[PDB]
Amino acid sequence: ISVRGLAGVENVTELKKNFNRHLHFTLVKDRNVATPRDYYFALAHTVRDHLVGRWIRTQQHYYEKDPKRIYYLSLEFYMGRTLQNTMVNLALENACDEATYQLGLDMEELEEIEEDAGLGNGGLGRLAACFLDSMATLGLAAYGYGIRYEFGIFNQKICGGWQMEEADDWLRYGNPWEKARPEFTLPVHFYGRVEHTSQGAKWVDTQVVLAMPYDTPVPGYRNNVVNTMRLWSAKAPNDFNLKDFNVGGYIQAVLDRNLAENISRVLYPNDNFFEGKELRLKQEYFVVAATLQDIIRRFKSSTNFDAFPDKVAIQLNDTHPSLAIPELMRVLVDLERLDWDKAWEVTVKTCAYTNHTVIPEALERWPVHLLETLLPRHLQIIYEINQRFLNRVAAAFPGDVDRLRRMSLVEEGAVKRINMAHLCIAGSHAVNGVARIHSEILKKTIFKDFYELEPHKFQNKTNGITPRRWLVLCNPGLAEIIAERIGEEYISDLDQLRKLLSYVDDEAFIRDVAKVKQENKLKFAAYLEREYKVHINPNSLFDVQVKRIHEYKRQLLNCLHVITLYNRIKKEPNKFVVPRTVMIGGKAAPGYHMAKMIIKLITAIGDVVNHDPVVGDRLRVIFLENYRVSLAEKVIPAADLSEQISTAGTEASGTGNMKFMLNGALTIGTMDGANVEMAEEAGEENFFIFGMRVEDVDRLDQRGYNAQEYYDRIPELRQIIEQLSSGFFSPKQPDLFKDIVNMLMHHDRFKVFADYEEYVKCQERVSALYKNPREWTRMVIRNIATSGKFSSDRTIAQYAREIWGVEPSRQRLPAP
Amino acid sequence: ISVRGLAGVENVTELKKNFNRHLHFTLVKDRNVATPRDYYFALAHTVRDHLVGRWIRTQQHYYEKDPKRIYYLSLEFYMGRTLQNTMVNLALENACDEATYQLGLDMEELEEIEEDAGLGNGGLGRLAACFLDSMATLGLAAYGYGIRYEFGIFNQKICGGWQMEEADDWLRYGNPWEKARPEFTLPVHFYGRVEHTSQGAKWVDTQVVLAMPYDTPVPGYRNNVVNTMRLWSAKAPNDFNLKDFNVGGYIQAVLDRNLAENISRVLYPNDNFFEGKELRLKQEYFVVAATLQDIIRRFKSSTNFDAFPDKVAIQLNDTHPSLAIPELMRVLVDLERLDWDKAWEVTVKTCAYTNHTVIPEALERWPVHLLETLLPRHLQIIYEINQRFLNRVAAAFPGDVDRLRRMSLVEEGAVKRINMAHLCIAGSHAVNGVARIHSEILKKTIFKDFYELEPHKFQNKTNGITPRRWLVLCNPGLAEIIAERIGEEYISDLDQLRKLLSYVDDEAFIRDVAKVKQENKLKFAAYLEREYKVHINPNSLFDVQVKRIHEYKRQLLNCLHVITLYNRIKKEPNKFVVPRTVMIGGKAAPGYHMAKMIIKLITAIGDVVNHDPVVGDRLRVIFLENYRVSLAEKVIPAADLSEQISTAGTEASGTGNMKFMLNGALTIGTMDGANVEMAEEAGEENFFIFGMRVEDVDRLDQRGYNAQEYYDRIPELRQIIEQLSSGFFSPKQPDLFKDIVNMLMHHDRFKVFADYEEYVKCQERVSALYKNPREWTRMVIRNIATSGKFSSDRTIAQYAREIWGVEPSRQRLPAP
Numbered sequence A, B: 001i002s003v004r005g006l007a008g009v010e011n012v013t014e015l016k017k018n019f020n021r022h023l024h025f026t027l028v029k030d031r032n033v034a035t036p037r038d039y040y041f042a043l044a045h046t047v048r049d050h051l052v053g054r055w056i057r058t059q060q061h062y063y064e065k066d067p068k069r070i071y072y073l074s075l076e077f078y079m080g081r082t083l084q085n086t087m088v089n090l091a092l093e094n095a096c097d098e099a100t101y102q103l104g105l106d107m108e109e110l111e112e113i114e115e116d117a118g119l120g121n122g123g124l125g126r127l128a129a130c131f132l133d134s135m136a137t138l139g140l141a142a143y144g145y146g147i148r149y150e151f152g153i154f155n156q157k158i159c160g161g162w163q164m165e166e167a168d169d170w171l172r173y174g175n176p177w178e179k180a181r182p183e184f185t186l187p188v189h190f191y192g193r194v195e196h197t198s199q200g201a202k203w204v205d206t207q208v209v210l211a212m213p214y215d216t217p218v219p220g221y222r223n224n225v226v227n228t229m230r231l232w233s234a235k236a237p238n239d240f241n242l243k244d245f246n247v248g249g250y251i252q253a254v255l256d257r258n259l260a261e262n263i264s265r266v267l268y269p270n271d272n273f274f275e276g277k278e279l280r281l282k283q284e285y286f287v288v289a290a291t292l293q294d295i296i297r298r299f300k301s302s303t304n305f306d307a308f309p310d311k312v313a314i315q316l317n318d319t320h321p322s323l324a325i326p327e328l329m330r331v332l333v334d335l336e337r338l339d340w341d342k343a344w345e346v347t348v349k350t351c352a353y354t355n356h357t358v359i360p361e362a363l364e365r366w367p368v369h370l371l372e373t374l375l376p377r378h379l380q381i382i383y384e385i386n387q388r389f390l391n392r393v394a395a396a397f398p399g400d401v402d403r404l405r406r407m408s409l410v411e412e413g414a415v416k417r418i419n420m421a422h423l424c425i426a427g428s429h430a431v432n433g434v435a436r437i438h439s440e441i442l443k444k445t446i447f448k449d450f451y452e453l454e455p456h457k458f459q460n461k462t463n464g465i466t467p468r469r470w471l472v473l474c475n476p477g478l479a480e481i482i483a484e485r486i487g488e489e490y491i492s493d494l495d496q497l498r499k500l501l502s503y504v505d506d507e508a509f510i511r512d513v514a515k516v517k518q519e520n521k522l523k524f525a526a527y528l529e530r531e532y533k534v535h536i537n538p539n540s541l542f543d544v545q546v547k548r549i550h551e552y553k554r555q556l557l558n559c560l561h562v563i564t565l566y567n568r569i570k571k572e573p574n575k576f577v578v579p580r581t582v583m584i585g586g587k588a589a590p591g592y593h594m595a596k597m598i599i600k601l602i603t604a605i606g607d608v609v610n611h612d613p614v615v616g617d618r619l620r621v622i623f624l625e626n627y628r629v630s631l632a633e634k635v636i637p638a639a640d641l642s643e644q645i646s647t648a649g650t651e652a653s654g655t656g657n658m659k660f661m662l663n664g665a666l667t668i669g670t671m672d673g674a675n676v677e678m679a680e681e682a683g684e685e686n687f688f689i690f691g692m693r694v695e696d697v698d699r700l701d702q703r704g705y706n707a708q709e710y711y712d713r714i715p716e717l718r719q720i721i722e723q724l725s726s727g728f729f730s731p732k733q734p735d736l737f738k739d740i741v742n743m744l745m746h747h748d749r750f751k752v753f754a755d756y757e758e759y760v761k762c763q764e765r766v767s768a769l770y771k772n773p774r775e776w777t778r779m780v781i782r783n784i785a786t787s788g789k790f791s792s793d794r795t796i797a798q799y800a801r802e803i804w805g806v807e808p809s810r811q812r813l814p815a816p
């Protein structure tokens, strides 16, 4: 078997008795009534047993050495399953595979029983998860802090072609990886009012909610380091949530506890979109307030807070945890009694902010009346921060009255709002973009004024993905043939993949690379019929676009091409065309009407295309249901063509693009986000780039975008629009897609028509290359061998050195 | 050390490593950061490990032998702590005590950390718990079925003398004894409507709630038998509780799941009182519906249901689970398609009902409109059952038109109601009272008409208590000296206690019995200052009345005596009186105004009495806060005088009275409930009986009860009433107790004044006996030696033989 570790004689034996120990004592089951679910749990408990020894010493180690601690605050942690990942980082995979084999069980069958920890929406949440893995592997004293939602991202079901949402009760059967720590429970306050006394302000008459932490281990890759991800759960106090007497009902008071506990009930399913609901604000303060208390308590142990920034670094994943800034000030000034200026100095020095997008509708602008009611003291502090900051601007740009209102944290208008992004820039010593182009756009556009004020704050840290889950875990076959030639060191040193460049002409390697891709496609084609049922051809080109559904991601542009391919086949049926299976998957936010309309369009196209006899097996349109982390681990290794076609300047970075590049897929995309650095790394000749560049989009906006022009000059495009309009794809409901056509023609913010011509032309070129297996594979090798820059180990090493002030280390911790 | 088992060399060693295994692997803690709570859990997991082996074989055994199964349905199971009880029934106590000692820990300190499983209100819930223990010890294939409330009986706090209720979050830190079984999850229906088709009625368009079972082991006493207590939890389905589309909000739909799950959220805190709230009805159907499905599934394994009653027996603990009757019919007729008559025959033969009280306000009378809306089909079935039953009556008593309306299950009037008690009698083959006198009152009064119709149905089964928790566990010192003389066999054969009768004149035994009582009092006096703080004299007579607060229990009568004692001391200060520490404890239902007023009266008396310098240490009035099972295990072994003074004919049986008798307390009480059989067993000369007999109460009711008469002829009583009226006990609020005085004088349903004179006179006699230590102790020995009849092992053996048709067995199951 592969390099999933050694199957030692002693350890396979030990593993088996421990599996049986847990099956008996833990699951209280006996082999005659044990269900596959029981088997999965016995295995999970057995594997978890192997890292507790290390978990304890790692934490005890940090207490003894007392290094600078890194706190990664995020309202999202898209973790996925954790059994296999743990086996991989502990080098237990083969041993476990062997032991379960002898016990007569299929480890892979058991792995499929674990529920995904879908505590994230998409890119932002998955980045946090990849980062945690990298920080452990690089031996950093890092803690992931978030909310323990009992309901993560909804499960997507397709009914009559429409998306149906259903509760993700991932904790239903229990979570063997987490452990409640009811000793560090903390109180969080809400509402109340502010009393200004003789020696300071006081936040009074507040409603209290308790925060209970749950620890989940985050093991580094084979270095015996296990860090901690601490997730907070909301709990109602038993007193006032019953003790505020004088009629109401005792039963009711108890039932009403599910009001304070609703705070950690569900994750908001919005990807790159802001909804100013009070429940959202409560979750944001809740995670911030509890986390900070825990951070300061740890520090008080390790009162001159002058050294605080030397021992603490808190990274803000977007503006979601932005209240950490005014909350840190509140504690320092109100409770610790530090002078404003000393407090501010400390705050700015420990906080750093990461921007994830430039679309306005994703920007957090919280109405003042909301902050006024829920967090009165924080509003006062934000006003004071704004006051002193604007004074700084005025001093720097005397008389520039418009710049003052442009930079204010407070926005005037219909209703006053607080620009959380401006808050973060002012109270952070570092602000970074997630890709070189996005980082430049921030300085030239969105945060230009801030950049002019303090240029030193703005940096870039191109995103990355973990090669452990995204290669070794999901594509062992590819990881193995690579290791056969260059060794195993690249798993924690992805740059070494370049060494594969010297095998680009190796006949055996070319054959191998092509073989694992073919095995991956056969396995996925099988899984498709197994769990979803309705056949696909594994010899065709696997064209896949998987990511959340968004107008800016342009799944619609993908559809136009699919319809074009179909129309061409119907025009010349007996002409040869490279067979394709185009797969589009992704979830739409429940309130995003357009995004839900696009899913129906995709399934509607498949209904026509998939049953046309003249088309045969040359073209299949499949919608990948419930796209999530665990599903990504299956499709990506099986893809040939990765679609990254967002309008230039809208996708901050993207990460799925990197996952595809590492797994042997070629990329067709625009010069957007990280696509630019990937093409730059692999060489543009090895990439399928097309469409407008940022500049072209801007030129078009100056003169004005008119979709009619494109409709008028392109007969193929016109034909498609008239097919949608006449009900060709919706016979029973001829006007079903009027909203889509209307939008494309009159309010297309992402100019889908503008990139149509260059897109289908470019798609022609990928089909030409696919016809030449040998050359396709050689280009694949150029992409894989050149993907090393996109490992989150590189990203983290840069954050560590350029933002946190800590030195990464690949030193093995002193055994378990 | 005592007979808490052997401290074997191998087992103490084994215990210690397992304690450390769990502390490390399970609690992921290390000795340097382990909290006492961690230590308690490591011990609990280690002890639980010892019974899983037996739990599995016991259950597998019942599958193989396939005996008749006993199902005990109750909405209450007052369990208390379970660590010590498990150690006792497994004979692990000494080994565990030794092992933790060597590990440098105090086992008793760790035991106090466990949370009480307060899933009961009082007597009814505790009986179910004692019964489960007896059924295991007698080797019966029995299952306890109930609801897993996340909030049990509220925790009682006394503020300014008033009771304050606060949520009992007993699961906060987890429950090491339970185990979720998500494989046997079942659906329960609500609402909907009934469609009458060609081949039967159909219950349609219902709302579904899922029932998830949690198993808790119930170990027999040293016989290697471990039965199961299965508790249901309400869970919302992820579909319709989200899938019923067409606007509303996705977030809201998820938050609204806490609406179907509220069913198992909290226990109704009513003791002997009926509240017709919909939530209560839902809990009742919920436990019934899920339990029955589980019972039939088990049977289908073991379709002629003719044999059903031969393999199944379901005991109804009060009318709370009465819907089991129409629900069993529904399943048999609607789903299994059995003819009505065959179905009814089966139902009556498998169901038995236990009545617990005769007070009207405790009777369950559910409004028809409620059953009509929530359970439409059941209402139809109840009407049909009533129809056929009344036809039986008419045939038996031709022309007796008044008897017909008296016996109907349907009550006419303001609003129509369903008499659940009448339902139970009609569909059960056996109806029993809980004490000989209560059982006779049922036949002569309340259910006279039913008794005349089917005399064979009515039986008696005097309640009992388990000698394991109620003697060996809470009073090891007494259990030991008893064992020193007559051996250990009496623990599971209480009748052998009679053998102690021959030591009634033994000088050494008399001294010993008196010594353990004195040690028990010193320990309790200590615990009082430790956890509640404010001293008491351990040399005084410990006069205690602990039970729920009720007008019928007459804590008020107890107060009158206390005030009388105080008034006499103030009249003749330098006269000698036997010192007393009277302790009154118990919880009042939150909506029971009078009961809450009585608690304030008790604390108000203590405020005056406890600070009067002339009184000195001769009289202390203490209110025992948060009386519960774990607290009972502490006070009872320390009591000298047990107060069981309910008005004759109101306390069906009582069980606390038995606990006191087994632990060396003398009883002062009325000829009520089981008090009659206890005095009968011990000899009236060894009991302090007083007041009216049932007959006297009836005579008084014929002529009419006038409290003024007693107030007029008794100067001491008058003086007390004038003290309450003038604010002597409430200076700042002189009219604070007007409600109590008003009630006593004009609407005393329990004639407190009528028993006043005989009560204080009798109290004089107990003080006279206490002055003679030797004789007091000899009378104590007569009570203890004669308590054997009150073991729940005797009760269960009678249920088994006279109702269930099964033979108890004290055979050890084939090792673990």
Ligand SMILES: Cc1c(NC(=O)NC(=O)c2ccc(Cl)cc2Cl)cccc1OCCCCC(=O)O
Residues within 6 Å of the ligand: A027, A028, A029, A030, A031, A032, A033, B055, B056, B059, B060, B061, B063, B179, B180, B181, B215
């Ligand atoms: C019931 C039982 C077992 N049972 C066990 O280990 N465990 C449990 O039952 C069990 C499971 C969970 C919890 Cl919390 C408590 C228990 Cl006691 C093992 C072997 C045989 C057995 O009887 C035969 C069942 C039917 C088998 C068949 O149909 O093939």
Ligand SMILES: Cc1c(NC(=O)NC(=O)c2ccc(Cl)cc2Cl)cccc1OCCCCC(=O)O
Residues within 6 Å of the ligand: A055, A056, A059, A060, A061, A063, A179, A180, A181, A215, B027, B028, B029, B030, B031, B032, B033
């Ligand atoms: C932190 C730690 C340990 N810690 C451990 O076992 N366990 C944990 O920390 C722990 C506990 C629960 C969970 Cl889910 C996960 C972990 Cl990793 C043991 C020995 C030393 C140690 O450092 C010193 C702490 C301070 C001691 C003092 O002040 O006396």
Ligand SMILES: *Cc1c(COP(=O)(O)O)cnc(C)c1O
Residues within 6 Å of the ligand: A121, A122, A123, A126, A546, A547, A548, A627, A628, A629, A632, A653, A654, A655, A656, A657, A659
């Ligand atoms: C990697 C990943 C994403 C982010 O994908 P992009 O194409 O960058 O938007 C979203 N969802 C899941 C399940 C992922 O694994």
Ligand SMILES: *Cc1c(COP(=O)(O)O)cnc(C)c1O
Residues within 6 Å of the ligand: B121, B122, B123, B126, B546, B547, B548, B627, B628, B629, B632, B653, B654, B655, B656, B657, B659
């Ligand atoms: C035994 C017991 C009861 C029942 O007591 P009675 O005096 O029969 O009403 C109530 N509560 C607890 C805690 C008990 O242990």
